[PDB]
């Protein structure tokens, strides 16, 4: 047993707060829930507080716990995420979307108390107001994706790299390519895994007594690529 | 207010065994069917976290046995998930829906096979659980049970979708793809020597490409394995597989220092004059990454 490992035995409550600005529409996302990383389990609510999303949902789900991620007994060796806790990591992205705008965000990921908490400032610029985000062309689900994680040891952290599909109401599909870097909060030492990927899988849905513009999020990760 | 708060006390007691609590508050009013603002009930958490004789006791005073939550999870999704056999078989004999999908699609099956329990699975199968069900990105619970190395959950599953014994060893089509493109030889590429080159003996397609555009050959150079490396360029790999990748194999045995890698890649054809899509030479990305040895084959390679 380890000691950031012994914070996730068991079920985990998850509080997300994202301060967000994208083209100057300002906007505010809570989120609640709980998380097992026994199971890479997330059952969570997020609530857009200011009023309507001016993105869609979808864009957003990367950017709303890696920490959650199942990690099989034989690469516990490898669990950048869980590592860094109680204190915490920094995660940074940027987020190209194809022929559109992009997103950069800053969160702290930490425990205050018993609960794992997001805090995300985010940022986005250069969207066409006719694109598929500022538009509201994409559809309301998501796609299985590959996440490629990398030691950067020079920094004491984890480079992250993958690329998310949205599908467009027409049928295509938008990409959004994610280049991610972690850094821990604190100064002990934390696990800088060899090369590995996460398999994941989410579904939205809607919870039909919520009036508030809203995302209801089951999602299941599991690293893997380790002998 | 009172009522709710009724129910709380409930949904904690449930959570955390208090049978005599569970007693007391439904002896004073406390709904069994009670639900918090995410659809949860007491039966759910009693399920999730196994307790039977709670689960008995909300049973027998009309808790409804298929509430579902807001992510679609029924009481038997969550013991099924959990590995409690005995409340797993009071739910089902209470009418459980077997085949209940929560807002991934998986079934009880999907969940017990993906967690490992095996008696589960078989009390399900009993039951009438659907072993050919698919999730929303096309997974059965075999596919899960082979995802998560449960070998004997996998044979169990073949036999009784009507394909025969064998099935912990993997499925009938070498060249199967999921809906990120991985074929099981994406997945071997991960340091499985032997599985890769049983695999490839059995016709799996060494130059598939996933919905990414890596090849079994970006993955072993990505993961650093010189051994499979080896085997795939010997059974075909195309040594400069690119195609949507936007980088070829020898860009990411540059990025990440692994030089034997490099070496193979270079007597068996590749291109070192290959851009990235930011326009950088594996030469380039060797010097970025601080790997000298590399550049300077690399160099030598001209």
């Not at chain 1, 990591?89 to 705008?101: A, C, L, N, P, S």
């Not at chain 2, 360029?233 to 540059?254: I, S």
């Amino acid at each position: 047993v380890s000691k950031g490992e012994e914070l996730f035995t068991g079920v985990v409550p998850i509080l997300v707060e994202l301060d967000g600005d994208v083209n100057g529409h300002k906007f505010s996302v809570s989120g609640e829930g709980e998380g097992d990383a026994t199971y890479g389990k997330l059952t969570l609510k997020f609530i857009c507080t200011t009023g309507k999303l001016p993105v869609p949902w979808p864009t957003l789900v990367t950017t709303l716990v890696q920490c959650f991620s199942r990690y099989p007994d034989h690469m516990k060796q490898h669990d950048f995420f869980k590592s860094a806790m109680p204190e915490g990591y920094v995660q940074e992205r940027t987020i190209f979307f194809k022929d559109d705008g992009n997103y950069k965000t800053r969160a702290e990921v930490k425990f205050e108390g018993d609960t794992l908490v997001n805090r995300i400032e985010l940022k986005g610029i250069d969207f066409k107001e006719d694109g598929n985000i500022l538009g509201h062309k994409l559809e309301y689900n998501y796609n299985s994706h590959n996440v490629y994680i990398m030691a950067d040891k020079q920094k004491n952290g984890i480079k992250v790299n993958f690329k998310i599909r949205h599908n467009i109401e027409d049928g295509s599909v938008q990409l959004a390519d994610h280049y991610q870097q972690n850094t821990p909060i604190g100064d002990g030492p934390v696990l800088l895994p060899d090369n590995h990927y996460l398999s994941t899988q989410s579904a939205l849905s809607k919870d039909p007594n919520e009036k508030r513009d809203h995302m209801v999020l089951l999602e299941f990760v599991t690293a893997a690529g380790i002998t | 207010g009172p009522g709710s708060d009724l129910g709380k006390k409930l949904l904690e007691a449930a959570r955390a065994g208090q049978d005599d609590e569970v007693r007391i508050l439904m002896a004073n009013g406390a709904d069994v069917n009670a639900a918090d603002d995410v659809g949860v009930t007491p039966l759910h958490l009693a399920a999730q976290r196994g307790h039977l004789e709670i689960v008995e006791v909300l049973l027998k005073y009309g808790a409804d046995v298929n509430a579902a939550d807001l992510w679609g999870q029924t009481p038997l999704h969550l013991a099924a998930t959990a590995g409690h056999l005995e409340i797993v078989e009071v739910l089902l004999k209470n009418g459980a829906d077997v085949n209940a999908r929560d807002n991934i699609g998986h079934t009880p099956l999907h969940l017990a096979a993906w967690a490992g329990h095996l008696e589960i699975v078989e009390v399900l199968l009993k039951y009438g659980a659907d072993v050919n069900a698919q999730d929303k990105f096309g997974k059965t619970p075999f596919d899960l049970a082979i995802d998560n190395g449960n070998e004997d959950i996998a044979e169990v599953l073949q036999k009784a979708a009507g394909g025969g014994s064998g099935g912990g060893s993997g499925g009938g089509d070498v060249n199967a793809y999921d809906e990120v493109g991985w074929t099981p030889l994406h997945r071997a590429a991960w340091g499985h020597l032997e599985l890769v080159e049983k695999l490839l003996k059995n016709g799996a397609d060494v130059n598939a490409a996933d919905i990414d555009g890596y090849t079994p050959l970006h993955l072993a150079a990505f993961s650093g394995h010189l051994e499979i490396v080896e085997v795939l360029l010997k059974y075909g790999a195309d040594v400069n597989a690119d195609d949507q990748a936007g980088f070829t194999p020898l860009h990411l045995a540059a990025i990440f220092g692994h030089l034997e890698i490099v070496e193979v890649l270079l007597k068996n054809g590749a291109d070192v004059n290959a851009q990235d899509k930011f326009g950088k030479t594996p030469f380039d990305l060797a010097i970025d990454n601080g790997n000298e040895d590399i550049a300077e084959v690399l160099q030598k390679a001209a």
